[PDB]
Amino acid sequence: LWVSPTGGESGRRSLQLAYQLARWNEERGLGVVFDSSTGFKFPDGSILSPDAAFVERGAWEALSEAEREGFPPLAPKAVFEVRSASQDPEELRAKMGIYLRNGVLLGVLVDPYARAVEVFRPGKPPLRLEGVERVSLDPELPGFALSLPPLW
Amino acid sequence: PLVLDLARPVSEEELRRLSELNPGYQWERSPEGRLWVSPTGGESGRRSLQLAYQLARWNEERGLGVVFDSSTGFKFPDGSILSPDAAFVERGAWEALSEAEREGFPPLAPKAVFEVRSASQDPEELRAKMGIYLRNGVLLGVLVDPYARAVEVFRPGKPPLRLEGVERVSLDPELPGFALSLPPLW
Amino acid sequence: PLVLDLARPVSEEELRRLSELNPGYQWERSPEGRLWVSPTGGESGRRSLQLAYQLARWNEERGLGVVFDSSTGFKFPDGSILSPDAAFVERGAWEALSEAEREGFPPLAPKAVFEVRSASQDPEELRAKMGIYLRNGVLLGVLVDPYARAVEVFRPGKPPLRLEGVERVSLDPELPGFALSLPPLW
């Protein structure tokens, strides 16, 4: 069926994910979290917009007002992509590669359909989990664990 | 936003594709059928996230409906496809939709919508957008202006309420027991 | 600038139309056919006028060509249509054109173009733009940064020069007798 990354289901899922990341950041304040609309300007020149992003406090603080106002010129420490029916797995997997190649330190891919999650880190093979309720995202995001059932 | 005039109303298919081809940009269809485009920079993105977070937190503890983030576009009665920074839809209204309707731009007016003024947006255009929401059936429209540190609440049949330098804002009874905290949005 | 992919090259016609409907912005066409939208006005607009005025003043004295402010867009061989903050076109070239060409987006590369960095522009993106000007025939590209209070000069086949702490920059031989004064642009 006709699906849009900017449609209801995708929006409902990305908010559920972003909500958790924000809940965690509210208590720890180690960085700044952005929603699915945010565009970031990556080192390779392109603009990319994940479903959620976390940028380390130190990286964010180094930015000027103008840089924070526009598409931030940096690779977020962590990026999250929630697969929507309109996207084929290998495509996002390919995108996770692009993120890492640009300096993202943690890429999390959630597939609500397959009901799995894939964790991408540089200099390490991709990790795929299925059947787990929560997934620890330490050490990149200290004390944060992503609860999966809410994303389904 | 920037207006792109077409001698043809942009289509839902074209909106999806434009979103795809332009990460970081929000595409919308006006009531007259024109294209509206606005970028979502870092500041906008952190504020809308924080606003959606508060709405979601409230909803998780209450369970009255469904919350959507800022990338979601809704299809209203007059044909416009608008994308607020946050929206709340009651369960009943959401469930009534077909799997296809939920997956595409939901054909309904969220009970409550939120818009956060970005630096590149003129205040009056955004206040006007609030009127479009209301005339299409939205029961609560909230406009946050982080630059003036003010918030304006719009309700059908009521004078818009503009509050300045306040810390909290009760959005009862449309959103039972929810109070939006403003400093986190500055 | 805001880069927009309409999934097809934007036509010259649409560029004008878009400028009309969105007056406070500059509209250009990239070599790939995408839309480049940039903010107009503010102190940046003021700097543009100051520069064009220094140029017009010099040209009045020498009479070698035509001066343009930030409002003109030029059509280059690669199909891009760019609008610098100011430009100089040699008299002969200008007249060799058709009245229509002179009235729209002149189809020629100015001998010299000037770009003044505005607050939302990345220095590296402006430098790449200078690269586009030169590969399309511009003989002298000048980039003014009022924030870092520096100037960069680009000539084909030569390394880019950056000057700081200077009050004036001579632009011979391309603009004989012309020295750009910087403080007025800060």
Side-chain angles (χ1 to χ4, degrees):
Chain A
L1 42 51
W2 200 78
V3 178
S4 185
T6 51
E9 282 290 282
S10 295
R12 174 180 74 71
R13 294 210 179 81
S14 54
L15 177 124
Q16 206 55 47
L17 191 151
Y19 164 61
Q20 291 183 48
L21 181 64
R23 187 174 56 188
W24 164 74
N25 193 237
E26 169 160 310
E27 295 309 323
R28 301 298 297 275
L30 300 173
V32 180
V33 177
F34 310 74
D35 72 14
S36 53
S37 286
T38 320
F40 292 87
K41 187 188 174 188
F42 286 73
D44 75 343
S46 58
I47 307 295
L48 300 168
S49 178
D51 284 312
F54 167 88
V55 172
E56 282 165 291
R57 175 164 301 296
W60 184 248
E61 301 190 323
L63 298 186
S64 70
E65 170 169 30
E67 290 176 318
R68 305 188 186 191
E69 282 294 338
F71 298 138
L74 77 211
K77 181 169 182 190
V79 300
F80 297 77
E81 294 286 4
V82 177
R83 189 209 157 187
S84 65
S86 172
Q87 308 172 307
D88 69 302
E90 287 313 311
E91 187 183 293
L92 281 176
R93 244 172 276 175
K95 195 186 185 184
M96 306 308 313
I98 297 181
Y99 280 131
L100 290 205
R101 268 173 251 147
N102 273 287
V104 171
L105 302 188
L106 174 70
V108 181
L109 174 56
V110 176
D111 193 325
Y113 307 98
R115 291 197 182 174
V117 52
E118 275 169 46
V119 184
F120 296 80
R121 288 181 240 252
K124 199 168 177 186
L127 168 65
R128 181 188 166 88
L129 315 211
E130 218 166 313
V132 298
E133 170 203 50
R134 315 189 69 200
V135 177
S136 169
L137 293 175
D138 247 278
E140 292 86 1
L141 307 178
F144 182 58
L146 178 66
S147 180
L148 302 180
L151 305 189
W152 301 163
Chain B
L2 303 170
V3 203
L4 307 205
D5 219 314
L6 316 166
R8 177 189 67 200
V10 62
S11 70
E12 290 170 24
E13 176 62 24
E14 284 158 330
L15 287 178
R16 174 179 80 184
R17 185 172 176 169
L18 292 170
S19 291
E20 298 194 350
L21 288 169
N22 302 277
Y25 293 90
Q26 174 177 108
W27 300 79
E28 290 170 301
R29 181 168 77 193
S30 75
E32 296 71 23
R34 308 189 183 183
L35 244 185
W36 285 351
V37 193
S38 50
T40 301
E43 286 299 72
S44 281
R46 41 165 282 260
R47 287 174 178 133
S48 53
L49 173 285
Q50 170 56 39
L51 201 163
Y53 158 72
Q54 290 186 45
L55 189 58
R57 188 171 61 194
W58 169 77
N59 191 55
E60 187 181 61
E61 59 176 58
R62 295 251 175 173
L64 295 181
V66 182
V67 179
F68 305 80
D69 62 16
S70 64
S71 63
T72 313
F74 295 84
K75 181 175 166 184
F76 301 76
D78 61 11
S80 62
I81 301 183
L82 310 184
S83 173
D85 288 308
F88 170 78
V89 177
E90 313 190 88
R91 292 204 199 194
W94 181 245
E95 295 314 324
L97 301 178
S98 78
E99 189 190 322
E101 300 179 309
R102 308 177 191 199
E103 201 70 60
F105 305 114
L108 89 205
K111 179 184 190 177
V113 302
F114 298 77
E115 288 283 8
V116 175
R117 196 207 163 206
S118 76
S120 56
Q121 174 120 66
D122 185 306
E124 217 59 293
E125 271 170 47
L126 212 44
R127 302 211 324 130
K129 193 183 188 186
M130 306 312 301
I132 297 179
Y133 281 125
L134 263 63
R135 86 180 198 209
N136 277 290
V138 173
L139 306 183
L140 177 64
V142 178
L143 166 51
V144 177
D145 183 325
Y147 301 93
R149 294 201 185 185
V151 52
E152 187 159 28
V153 189
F154 301 72
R155 290 187 172 87
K158 290 174 191 162
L161 236 194
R162 176 171 204 295
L163 322 182
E164 307 175 314
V166 286
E167 183 154 43
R168 282 184 154 184
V169 69
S170 171
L171 298 174
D172 272 275
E174 292 79 3
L175 301 170
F178 178 55
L180 178 64
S181 175
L182 307 170
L185 299 318
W186 299 160
Chain C
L2 296 189
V3 177
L4 297 177
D5 191 334
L6 287 62
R8 61 163 171 66
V10 60
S11 72
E12 179 179 73
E13 193 170 69
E14 303 172 319
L15 256 202
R16 312 197 194 202
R17 184 174 186 180
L18 286 172
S19 293
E20 307 179 68
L21 286 67
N22 302 275
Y25 303 77
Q26 175 180 81
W27 299 78
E28 302 170 294
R29 182 170 67 193
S30 75
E32 297 76 34
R34 288 183 185 87
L35 229 46
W36 282 353
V37 192
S38 297
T40 259
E43 185 65 339
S44 298
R46 194 231 101 216
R47 300 188 175 102
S48 296
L49 287 184
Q50 160 64 32
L51 214 163
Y53 166 73
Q54 282 188 58
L55 212 47
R57 179 166 170 287
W58 164 78
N59 187 56
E60 188 56 41
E61 176 189 73
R62 308 289 295 233
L64 307 172
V66 184
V67 172
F68 302 69
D69 52 32
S70 69
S71 77
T72 305
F74 300 86
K75 185 183 295 172
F76 299 86
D78 66 359
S80 65
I81 297 173
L82 308 185
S83 189
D85 284 308
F88 172 78
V89 179
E90 223 132 48
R91 202 82 218 183
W94 185 236
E95 308 195 314
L97 296 192
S98 91
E99 185 55 39
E101 307 186 301
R102 283 188 287 275
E103 281 178 43
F105 295 121
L108 50 64
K111 194 182 185 194
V113 300
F114 296 75
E115 290 282 4
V116 181
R117 182 198 177 186
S118 68
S120 62
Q121 294 170 306
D122 170 64
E124 284 312 304
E125 282 176 40
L126 276 175
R127 287 188 251 231
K129 198 182 184 195
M130 307 307 306
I132 291 181
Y133 281 122
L134 307 206
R135 88 199 190 193
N136 276 292
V138 176
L139 295 184
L140 172 73
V142 172
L143 180 42
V144 177
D145 191 324
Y147 310 115
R149 283 186 199 186
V151 56
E152 289 187 9
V153 177
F154 300 74
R155 296 192 163 86
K158 290 193 184 60
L161 331 181
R162 183 189 171 87
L163 297 182
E164 288 176 59
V166 66
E167 292 188 295
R168 304 168 48 167
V169 175
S170 162
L171 290 179
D172 288 286
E174 294 81 3
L175 302 177
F178 183 60
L180 176 68
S181 175
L182 306 175
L185 294 171
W186 299 158

